[PDB]
Amino acid sequence: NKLFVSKEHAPYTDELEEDVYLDPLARVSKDKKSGSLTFNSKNIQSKDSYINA
């Protein structure tokens, strides 16, 4: 009975929410600790995501 599993957090921390909404190239990566999909400080507004796009 695990089909629906309510998300108890957004992919962004509250203190990162705005930064994400504003970088069009911001994308999620697997976290190390949690293993779940989050936005990293290092991928929001990066040179590497400009090149890589």
């Binding site: 998300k7 957090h9 962004y12 705005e18 504003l22 970088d23």
Partner: protein, 145 residues
């Protein structure tokens, strides 16, 4: 010149206001040393004008091939073979032109991550961010909002 809808984030309070709509200002600043020719109308206009000419002799070139088709296979009931066809050529011509107008005038910033929707919305008319003079707030008179 722009209209957008945006949801917020994961939550549990339905009546709550959020910052989903902030995404209409999203642009990428990871590289902003030198001016983007794309923002420059003088630039775009030249690019269009080239396409305009490019289309011109496409229509000439197409109209030429039509003469060669009529001069060899159609009878003296040629008036409607010529009507239906040249008509269709001029459609396609205008369509191409309209698309070029589109590419360089209307939607030049669509596929650009350095130009935010709000930016370009104003930019198509030669307007800068500073030109947005008035903000009509929802301003519900609630503390939250």
């Amino acid at each position: 010149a722009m209209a957008a809808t945006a949801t917020d984030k994961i939550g549990r309070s339905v009546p709550a206001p959020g910052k989903g709509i902030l995404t209409t200002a999203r642009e990428h600043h990871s590289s902003v040393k030198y001016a983007s020719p794309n923002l420059n109308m003088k630039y775009r206009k030249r690019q269009l004008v080239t396409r305009e000419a490019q289309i011109k002799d496409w229509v000439e070139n197409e109209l030429e091939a039509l003469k060669l088709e009529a001069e060899e296979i159609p009878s003296e009931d040629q008036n409607e073979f010529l009507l239906e066809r040249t008509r269709e050529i001029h459609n396609e011509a205008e369509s191409q032109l309209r698309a070029a107008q589109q590419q360089w005038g209307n939607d030049f910033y669509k596929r650009d991550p350095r130009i935010a929707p709000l930016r370009g919305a104003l930019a198509t008319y030669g307007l800068t961010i500073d030109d947005l003079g008035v903000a009509s707030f929802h301003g519900t008179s609630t503390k939250a909002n």
